[PDB]
């Protein structure tokens, strides 16, 4: 039926529906709007007034104006024909390759798959990035949440991975530009086209694009994630698929939530927070999975709000993580791209278990050495390491070398780097550390280890240095 704008305060549209008054989450389409101006019901405030959230923007809405409940959640086109396609939140192709001829629609609430239904045997998704695999190994189906500072090649990295990985992949991928720079999406577009992974004579790209960019109005950004989940479930469950799901950025989901919270007349938790950050998270998270019916290998961009992790939001998030990617600005400041800090960037699935102890141990020595080093830099910060034990000096330097050795060129961003990408299979990875660890290497320059590919390249470089 129809409702009246009784109050518009931003995208919180207070609608008095009397005529019906459907449940919450019923999508309403506003009468008097050329736009498919969805408000999705948020509260039944009573008085058969609901608080709705326009997903969309508003304006030009004379109050009282008639809104006709569309009566259900966002139902959105589904089917494989979404691959390639960039659809907006409301599922309309914003690839604008005409429309999409769906198969069905889906309510963009999708739920938690069952505990009993899960198959849950984490297996490394390898990446060929030394630093990654080794330190922050990724698991097939895994949810990796990419904490990372702004612009730190955070995006770059994810992309870079996407190339490396999504190519190799056999399952599909979904790219959800949530709240993303449209621009970056443009850019993205063009690589994808270019790459032909989005091959456009293929709505059967390996990747479906859903974009609900930065520009959207909040609601749209808030909800678009849920949408994305719904899609991927389509591909997994329905189409089998191991999805790689790129989310840039779940933070904006969060953001959106909090932003509305106020307007949702809430007591908005700390910092203004949506307290329903939590519920949101759960409710999302549980949709996220890697069922028996496949994988949503979940690449979740997580902007680290104010790069505070301490920040409840990430704090919560961690619980849901399985692989954590912390890009570390400090490191970034050390110039390094890779900029990760793996004492932070950790993966539940990083285990002597899941990824070998070699990895673990070689790492444990590393993690250790670094950990110690980390301890040291500060005393050293004053003292230098000067009157401080040489073995330490060695080790420190080694730790660092190892650090440097982790620095790895970007093939994608050869423009950016200058440097020409490197990708290193595991063995040479192991080898590398084991060697450096062997001190075998160490008679060498630190910077030799910089921006290497395999250790050879460091060797090569050593010569090239000295």
């Amino acid at each position: 039926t129809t409702g009246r704008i009784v109050a518009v305060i931003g995208a919180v549209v207070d609608v008095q529906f009397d005529e019906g008054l459907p449940p919450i989450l019923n999508a309403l389409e506003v009468q008097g709007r050329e736009t498919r101006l969805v408000l999705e019901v948020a509260q039944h405030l009573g008085e058969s007034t609901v608080r709705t959230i326009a997903m969309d923007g508003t304006e030009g809405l004379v109050r009282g104006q008639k809104v006709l409940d569309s009566g259900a959640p966002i139902r959105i086109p589904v089917g494989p024909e979404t691959l390639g396609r960039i659809m907006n939140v409301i599922g309309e192709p914003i690839d604008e390759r005409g429309p999409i001829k769906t198969k069905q629609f889906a309510a963009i609430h999708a739920e938690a798959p069952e505990f009993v239904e899960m198959s849950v045997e984490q297996e490394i998704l390898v990446t060929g990035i030394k630093v990654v695999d080794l330190l922050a190994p990724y698991a097939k189906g895994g949810k990796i949440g990419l904490f990372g500072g702004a612009g730190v090649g955070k995006t770059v990295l994810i992309m870079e991975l996407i190339n490396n990985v999504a190519k190799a992949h056999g399952g599909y991928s979904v790219f959800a530009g949530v709240g993303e720079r449209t621009r970056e999406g443009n850019d993205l577009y063009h690589e994808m086209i270019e790459s032909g992974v989005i091959n456009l004579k293929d709505a059967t790209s390996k990747v479906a694009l859903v974009y609900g960019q930065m520009n959207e109005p909040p609601g749209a950004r808030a909800r678009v994630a849920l949408t994305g989940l719904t899609v991927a479930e389509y591909f997994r469950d329905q189409e089998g698929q191991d999805v790689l799901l790129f989310i840039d950025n779940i933070f904006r989901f969060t953001q959106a939530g909090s932003e509305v919270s106020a307007l949702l007349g809430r007591i908005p938790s700390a910092v203004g927070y949506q307290p329903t950050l939590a519920t949101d998270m759960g409710t999302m998270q549980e949709r996220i999975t890697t069922t028996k019916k496949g994988s949503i290998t979940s690449v979740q961009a997580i902007y680290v709000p104010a790069d505070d992790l301490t920040d409840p939001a990430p704090a919560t998030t961690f619980a849901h993580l399985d692989a954590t990617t912390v890009l570390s600005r400090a490191i970034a400041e050390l110039g390094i791209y890779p900029a990760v800090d793996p004492l932070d960037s950790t993966s539940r699935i990083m285990d002597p278990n899941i990824v070998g102890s070699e990895h673990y141990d070689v790492a444990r020595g590393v993690q250790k050495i670094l950990q110690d080093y980390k301890s040291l830099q500060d005393i050293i910060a004053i003292l230098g390491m000067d009157e401080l034990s040489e073995e330490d000096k060695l080790t420190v330097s080694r730790a660092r070398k190892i650090q440097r050795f982790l620095s790895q060129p970007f093939q994608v961003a050869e423009v950016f780097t200058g440097h020409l990408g490197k990708l290193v299979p595991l063995k040479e990875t192991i080898k590398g550390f084991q060697q450096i660890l062997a001190g075998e290497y160490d008679h060498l320059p630190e910077q030799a280890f910089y921006m290497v590919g395999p250790i050879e390249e460091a060797v090569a470089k050593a010569d090239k240095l000295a």
Partner: protein
Amino acid sequence: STTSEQSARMTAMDNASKNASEMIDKLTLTFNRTRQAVITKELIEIISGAAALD
């Protein structure tokens, strides 16, 4: 030996204390910021708790 040493120690004390100086500076930001942060959080807590007392 000792002469060399004494000047080196002297030197040593020079660098360090400078080093010290910058670090202080850095902290000092962190300071205020957080300093305010407190207040802020707290003010938050006040305002909120004053908009939400029994």
